[PDB]
Design a protein around this ligand. Structure first.
Ligand SMILES: NC(=O)C1=CN([C@@H]2O[C@H](COP(=O)(O)OP(=O)(O)OC[C@H]3O[C@@H](n4cnc5c(N)ncnc54)[C@H](OP(=O)(O)O)[C@@H]3O)[C@@H](O)[C@H]2O)C=CC1
Ligand SMILES: NC(=O)C1=CN([C@@H]2O[C@H](COP(=O)(O)OP(=O)(O)OC[C@H]3O[C@@H](n4cnc5c(N)ncnc54)[C@H](OP(=O)(O)O)[C@@H]3O)[C@@H](O)[C@H]2O)C=CC1
Ligand SMILES: CC1(C)N=C(N)N=C(N)N1OCCCOc1cccc(Cl)c1Cl
Ligand SMILES: CC1(C)N=C(N)N=C(N)N1OCCCOc1cccc(Cl)c1Cl
Ligand SMILES: O=c1ccn([C@H]2C[C@H](O)[C@@H](COP(=O)(O)O)O2)c(=O)[nH]1
Ligand SMILES: O=c1ccn([C@H]2C[C@H](O)[C@@H](COP(=O)(O)O)O2)c(=O)[nH]1
Lengths: 513, 514
């Protein structure tokens, strides 16, 4: 009615084409991985590392299961190299690439029968390459049930993962180096030199490298582990700005003595193409809160309790009876924030009485109008909305911070720019980037467009003196690949979307600082 | 009175020009020699002529020098001495002589006859100091803006002072004639510092022009050539390269009209407003007078475009005409009555609108006044911004705001400003917008005891019109020159009372029409 009806192109725009994945490999001092039939060395330490890496789930105490586990992709020749007693690999979805062998054909080559019924759901053959597997793994019954997809081998498989379109989906490369006294390899693994067309535009950098370890294989073979990740220039934008703000920002102390380092005016860009979701990796982002709050904004809500009831307490300090009163909002029921954010978005200028009254047709519905223009006249330059209403400011628990957004369209993609007057680089900005990335994504799905990019304009960009110590540490971390957002379900109206309708996959942020 | 914004006692001390900008003319041989300490070792009539025309002529055409409008030349006392009394002072120019031994009267007494010193009294002034003191004198009201361009004309000591801070930062151009002198044996030299060296002080001298090798009719067939160097203007380059990127990578788009553009989404540029600098682009003259009249017009919260048209500023005629207004369904508006646009929102945000001449005193939110007050008591407040983008009022506006948001920031007594423009015509709009908001920051600063800092410009739909691509590509050939400056010849009791004539842009030398 006064809600926004999603078109019939809802799911296509954000349908995941290929699932992201990681790569594991052991290599000798020459890049050798095998002679074509087997691995010419025996370092049990690497075997354990491989077992644990591809088996373990990130969550604490979560044991693999059809509901939640990792998958492993391997060339058919690699499947045959594994002794039948060790097949299929336990706790992981075994995926085999074969133009001939079928799923059951693999189940038959196993010793037991009272076992093949257990592995029925643990093995799958794909008549195609890694790409074909990545597409199969991206479908609904594998995503997000499968937490991480690991390419575990086959010279040809590694080779395919290192060329487009697969390399663009490689989140990390775990490479073990074995200083073997022997050199009997004919199948290798090499990462294209930077700048080369073979590199694709990716620059692999070391996140970690172990000390030189000595194997207990009887030969004291020397080896070491190493982790490579694709340079995330977008997150680097953010780290660079924080660092600049800390090293050259103006120093100020407010009426309480609260210190800040700041600059005025900055801009960042983030891609939202192909399901990409710019959730910073150097410090985990409270995605569940971001999502619940945005949906909350879009519905034009003003009652913070709906948030705190879901475990999202970001608005508690500003919706308390105490804070409301310090604002002169003595008559607002507690947690009633007044005509903030979402209300102005959907009912700009309308008079406010109390949260959750019906406001149909009151004020200007900026979001609805932009939905219409985006669909009929995409070149329009008036497609923006604001929560900055000087007339209503006094009635707000707080004045809007991210206060303006403008949309733009080119090549069938929706782009958005956010204007933020005050930016806490440490605790706010990452949250804000997430919030508006999602907004652009949702608006794109509601207008038959595809997610383009988020442009973030910052006014007062700052770092609180306190946060300086923590931030300097976070700045040492090399950013990781960004995660992806998928929709497990769609809705008839934009206002009916729920946090559970969507899921962030392949998000592997660094631990707390 | 209370509806207006009263200027403080510091209104003039803050935008007060400390030093006047200048240019430098010099003739050096191939080893950087300029003289033996007493005179110039060579005789090249053509250079003497170049010097004469360059320092005497005023910009434009058929404008002869006059006491109320001419250039000035600054020279050391030894250079003044080297000129034969029969040529002193240099006609058509204010001759400024640096000296700690001779007064202005002593300079006059040193002239040949009385008929010469009597007439030539308003053409000579001696300053008891160096080039810097001279530039400060020149910055005073009786010399600025009356003096169009200041030229440093010599004395090794003077050239040296012009090439080191604080003076080099005010050096807008270097006109250097190189004499290919057969034999050279000077004792006084000159030489510009290379890019990247400390002595250059971050300045990257660019060669705007260089003549072909010329032969002097001095009798010795002496070879010589001319050069004009300019301090690289990175700021204007932000704009040129953005235009160039739009043309090469921009997406094609069309207006409701059907007119095509090339555009990119989201960009940002910065401009310093320190020491009276005003970012008026040089690769294409900007209509300053219209910029100023309109900006003041916004500040008063005006909505009647005829106030501008009656001042030879017709930038609003096309959108305030009976025809355009009817096309917008605003038939109850008298012609040129734009509706609650721009300034109306700035000073009376949210106020109901009827007609441009109704009394709106105290109606709606006066965002400008509120910001001026926070700026003077709580400078680090992070909510200092105003907006003309009022969803409620849009339908009643001739057209929705382009530059729709502005936020201020303070640091070290300096005022910075951030403009947010949703749509940006790079060719004809953007240069104008940068100028107006640079002006705004300066006026707000003057109104709050602050000094102009920086202007940050955020661009939304940044585009170049199809019918401008070619002419723009051309403009892109030009190497931008140094920006001009802004000075106020007088002040006002209230912000709303300032007039375009209260201020003047000086040392603005844009390239001629493409
Ligand atoms: N050092 C290490 O960490 C590792 C080393 N290895 C070593 O690597 C060597 C194996 O490498 P390699 O010969 O490349 O073999 P792979 O293990 O990659 O197997 C290749 C086979 O996978 C299938 N396949 C690959 N691409 C496709 C496709 N696009 N469509 C259909 N089927 C496809 C084919 O099966 P089919 O023939 O049925 O059509 C194919 O012949 C061995 O020596 C093994 O020991 C293996 C893993 C790890
Ligand atoms: N090639 C060219 O284009 C030019 C060459 N020349 C050559 O340059 C040589 C002259 O150079 P140079 O000896 O450096 O002389 P200058 O022409 O620079 O004169 C220096 C004199 O100017 C005055 N002065 C300079 N700075 C100050 C100050 N800070 N405070 C007070 N007075 C100051 C002093 O006057 P006082 O002593 O009275 O106190 C001083 O001795 C000559 O040979 C002349 O021919 C000159 C102009 C141009
Ligand atoms: C593990 C190993 C080399 N080590 C690392 N670091 N990465 C891999 N991808 N590997 O290869 C896994 C495929 C080959 O697996 C086997 C080959 C022979 C016996 C057994 Cl039990 C297994 Cl699992
Ligand atoms: C002129 C000259 C070198 N030429 C150029 N291009 N630049 C200068 N700065 N000059 O020096 C001017 C100071 C000395 O001027 C004279 C010296 C002797 C006689 C006469 Cl009539 C004059 Cl104006
Ligand atoms: O979405 C938001 C909301 C707030 N902040 C930060 C900026 C400031 O550090 C503080 C709000 O204080 P003021 O700017 O209003 O003073 O919260 C953000 O970064 N993002
Ligand atoms: O201050 C201004 C006013 C207008 N424009 C330009 C931008 C657009 O090219 C056109 C206005 O059209 P819309 O964006 O409203 O469609 O005028 C500017 O660049 N600056």
């Amino acid at each position: 009615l006064f809600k926004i009806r999603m078109p019939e192109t809802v799911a296509e725009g954000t349908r995941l084409a290929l699932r992201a994945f990681s790569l594991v490999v052991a290599v000798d001092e020459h890049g050798g991985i095998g002679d074509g039939r087997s691995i010419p060395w025996n370092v049990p330490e690497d075997m354990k590392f491989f077992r644990d890496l591809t088996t373990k789930l990130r969550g604490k105490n979560v044991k693999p299961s059809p509901a939640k586990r990792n998958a492993v992709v391997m060339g058919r020749k690699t499947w045959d190299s594994i002794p039948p007693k060790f097949r299929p690999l336990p706790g992981r979805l075994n995926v085999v690439l074969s133009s001939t062998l079928t799923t059951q054909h693999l189940l038959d080559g196993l010793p037991d029968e009272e076992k093949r019924n257990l592995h029925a759901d643990s093995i799958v053959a794909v008549n195609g390459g890694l790409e074909q597997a990545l597409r199969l793994l991206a479908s609904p019954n594998y995503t997000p049930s499968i937490e991480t997809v690991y390419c575990i081998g086959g010279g040809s498989v590694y080779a395919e993962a290192l060329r487009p379109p697969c390399v663009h989906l490689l989140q990390a490369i775990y490479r073990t180096t074995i200083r073997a006294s022997e050199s009997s390899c004919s199948v290798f693994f090499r990462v294209p030199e930077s700048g080369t067309e073979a590199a694709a535009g990716i620059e692999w950098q070391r996140e970690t490298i172990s000390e030189e370890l000595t194997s207990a294989n009887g030969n004291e073979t020397k080896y070491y582990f190493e982790k490579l990740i694709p340079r995330n220039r977008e997150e680097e934008q953010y780290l660079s700005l924080v660092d600049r703000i800390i090293r050259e920002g103006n120093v100020k102390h407010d009426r309480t003595g609260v210190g800040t380092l700041s600059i005025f005016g900055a801009q960042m860009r983030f891609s939202l193409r192909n399901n990409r979701l710019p959730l910073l990796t150097t410090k985990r982002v409270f995605w569940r809160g971001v999502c619940e709050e945005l949906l909350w904004f879009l519905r034009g809500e003003t009652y913070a309790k709906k948030l705190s009831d879901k475990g999202v307490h970001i608005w508690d300090d500003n919706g308390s009876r105490a804070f409301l009163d310090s604002r002169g909002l003595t008559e607002y029921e507690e947690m009633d924030l007044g005509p903030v954010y979402g209300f102005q978005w959907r009912h700009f200028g309308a008079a406010y009485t109390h949260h959750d009254a019906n406001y149909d047709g009151q004020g200007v519905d900026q979001i609805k109008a932009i939905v219409e223009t985006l669909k009929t006249n995409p070149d329009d330059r008036r497609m923006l909305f604001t929560a900055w209403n000087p007339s209503a400011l006094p009635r707000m628990a707080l004045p809007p911070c991210h206060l303006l957004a403008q949309f733009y369209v080119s090549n069938g993609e929706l782009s958005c720019m956010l204007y933020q007057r005050s930016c806490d680089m440490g605790l706010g900005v990452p949250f804000n980037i997430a919030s508006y990335a999602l907004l652009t994504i949702l608006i794109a799905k509601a207008t038959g467009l595809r997610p383009g990019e988020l442009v973030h304009t910052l006014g007062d960009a700052h770092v609180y003196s306190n946060h300086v110590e923590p931030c300097n540490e976070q700045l040492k971390r090399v950013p990781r690949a960004f995660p992806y957002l998928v929709f497990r379900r769609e809705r008839e109206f934009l206002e009916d979307y729920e946090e559970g309708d969507m899921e962030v996959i392949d998000y592997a942020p660094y631990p707390p600082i």
